[PDB]
């Protein structure tokens, strides 16, 4: 359970800076599964919801960065692309997490038609299927979502 | 204040229903400072920051209004007024809600040219300012930020 | 602020219900503890939605209705009206329970899905001034309110 | 929990100062069975009963003002109009409540052809009901009977 | 109080399969008369409200019975229906009660006092019978049995 | 009463300020009957007594206003038209009250002639039947008599 | 409770053997609500779910039917048609019932299309509801499911 | 005491919603009278010295009223027209509060000619006296100021 989630760390972060491309960790590690339930529990604060936010500022930021000069992400996601990865292990929550990053995306001016979601059986393939989301020219931004419990 | 507190809940509530313009009550009162601090910095966002959404999404299901038809608040905030009523009393906290505020109505697609701040001596005299921000047209939201220490 | 928040509530709505002339159900469940919010959301006999629900029937015919001796009392045959519902997101597990339960009771009783508007607001503080615009529409013949606060 | 009673309170009592006319708060407020009761009981009347006299001597006495001049009205209702709204929650105690009001205005001179009934499901609803009759040009009194337990 | 009840419960259950017309079954059995109290006190309707509802609601099931799978239910809009209603005389204190819920049930509900047909009898023996008749009436959709057993 | 008190406060309250027309609160509200004879049985302390005498300070001042300035009512009750409202039930009070009031008036100078008595069946229609006297354009005052028992 | 669930059992098994058609009871009795948790709560299947199979093998049965001859049914579910009587009294353990019995006929190669489904108010309207779905000719079996809480 | 509290401040409130005029709470409502003292304890931060310093705030504010745009009050009370609503129970404190408030008003640089005193018997008759000043279109701002002992 430890390899797993140092691999996934590691291989999201070596992703995100080799294609310049915003990735965001919304991987759940808990020991036990209560507090896997507490990071989601009924809350409009989920894990997904939140990693959907980070996403949709980072998008925007990176739209216009490619006194002083302050740059910084507006959350108007209308008009962008993004892809999701989830896994499928203890999908109970994952669906859960799944539901309110889509939710926020919509909330916030998303188009369903502009998000692709891809399944994988194993938090250890997340990495690998993600880089090809990632690659893909008509992607804006790439949201990982998965659970570990120990 | 209790005696001002539900006077101002009441004269807001009154402004509310009478004018039908959303206004959202961010006051926050507390019977001791250290509950202040609490509710203040960084809990779960400032209650302003929170206010300001609440304000955003019932200004855009108002514009709307303007199987079954569902009505909902989309949470951008392009081309719509707001007004803000901060008291002064504890500018140490109010200053960080009014911080909150801005910063969600800006990055959600609001400008800040039409943001309309009005500053007033103490809680009491609230509702009364409130009611002239409301009254004029070019306004489509009222946040009321205010502090009640016990 | 639970105690702030029901008093503005009760007070917001009657005082709608008088000034728009047009009928309001009060449907909100105020409960200090969790369990009670259950026990009247788990359907025993019904939820406070099918409660609400058949009241504002009888509410919206009486008016139709109105507007030896005189007596005058409304049927609970819901076909030909529409109905304004206005449902709070905090705590929306229970929220979606009493919604059914209201649109259920409307349904069975001759009423048809297409003639019910369903608006969704953030906190309870915004349930009235909600509620205010969808009595105002001259279409609407009923408004229900439907609502949960936990102290 | 009365917030219910503190509401209907409130709304007739502002109606009656609104509409500038009489309104009598035939309720019977009370948590336990047996109390409600006995308050539809004939110790001292049945509530209606006592509620419908209030409401003849009060529409006289606004018939009448509209040494030291005294103004008052009589119990006598030849002629005048009344609004009974009435609900039907413990409808058990109701009936007899409203029998009791009916009993009262047609005993003391007035005619069953102007009372005009409405018939409510819940007491919240008194308050909007009672907002037609009131309204009404050709009401001179109104009634408002309910129970809350 | 034993034989009786046990004998009006199966009579009118083989008479309700024999002629195959709903027979709903509003009799109190109560062994004091302070239970008899609890179930003609207001509990969300008398036992007469809620035995027309029933008997609504079933009639309505045979007329629809006489996408992935067909779900038959019945509505609660009893117009155009016509109903027999056989009730006791006897501890006619409560028993006009029920039978006040009943009609007052089925008038609301949309139907019409004149398609109601009621039947008075002396005392519970005589129910079974009586609602044979009413039941063997080809005009009749429905039959309410209407009675009261104090031990 | 609860409910009885408070309706009868903003019962006259809210027709004080909207008429604009002086109003005197004279209702003993007590929850023992000899706290309610203590108050209407005072030596030389007649709740009625000071009621009436407020409301001919309050006359005088309202009939003026419709270094630095001053304004304030002299007890000279010469010249000013009163209606009184008493309730019927508990009457042993009442009249003792209305007899105080009335001799309170008299002894500052006031005219039998000028004072109108109307009495009403209950507390609870207090507020209606003293809207119509404040009504009357030749009324200077209002004073409103009742006993609440718990 | 003693009433009811006497003449239910007695109606239904006359009606099996008058219209010679199959009709499982799958009413189950209980006193408090802990024998209808422990009943229902998917131990191996619940009643439905066991009225479903022997309602399955007893159709079979009865398609052939109507040295030595032994006949015996088998536990297809293809090709026969199915009626059901639910009860609306505490639906919330009536789904769980009804759900076991569908799982049942569909596993066993059924196809949902022959269910025909119907809600009854009470448990005293399920033999007559239970006749005509056995006198219907294209029904073969009948499940009746039923809830009666002591 | 609760009753009349409660009463004044609903007064207040409507008042300056209904007349668009700023009012100013300046009531003591204590428990103890040595409490009430030390409200007004010799120090320059009286009840009427701080209520005098809000309401020429609110009065400038609301004179220009009727990056972004944001509106506060000076200090500036000269060609400002103040009244002042005093009680006349307790008068050993009322004094005090009043000459605070005065003596504000001129520190500050208002004049005493368009500084209006109105004295009222009780606090019940605040709200009533305290409409005719605010009714007054030669009123800039209205303060009120009273003790409730309880």
């Known amino acids: 359970f ?8 590691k291989g999201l972060a ?3 800076l080799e294609l310049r491309k915003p ?3 919304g ?17 409009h604060g989920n894990k997904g919801w ?7 500022e980072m998008a925007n930021l990176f739209k216009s960065l490619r ?3 302050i740059y910084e992400g507006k959350l108007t996601a209308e008009g962008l692309r993004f892809g999701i990865v989830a896994s499928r292990f203890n999908h109970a929550l994952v669906d859960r997490l799944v539901e309110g990053a889509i939710d926020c995306i919509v909330r916030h001016g998303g188009r369903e038609e502009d998000i692709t979601l891809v399944r994988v059986p ?11 989301l ?10 990982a979502i998965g659970v570990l419990i120990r």
């Open 2 to 9: 430890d390899y797993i989630a140092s691999e996934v760390s």
């Open 14 to 16: 070596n992703l995100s």
């Open 23 to 25: 990735i965001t960790f």
């Open 27 to 43: 991987v759940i590690t808990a020991d036990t599964l209560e507090q896997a339930i507490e990071r989601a529990g009924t809350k």
């Open 50 to 56: 939140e990693a959907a936010l980070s996403a949709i």
């Open 67 to 69: 006194s002083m000069e």
């Open 122 to 132: 194993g938090s250890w393939e997340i990495p690998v299927a993600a880089g090809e």
């Open 134 to 143: 990632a690659r893909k020219e008509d992607i804006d931004a790439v949201i």
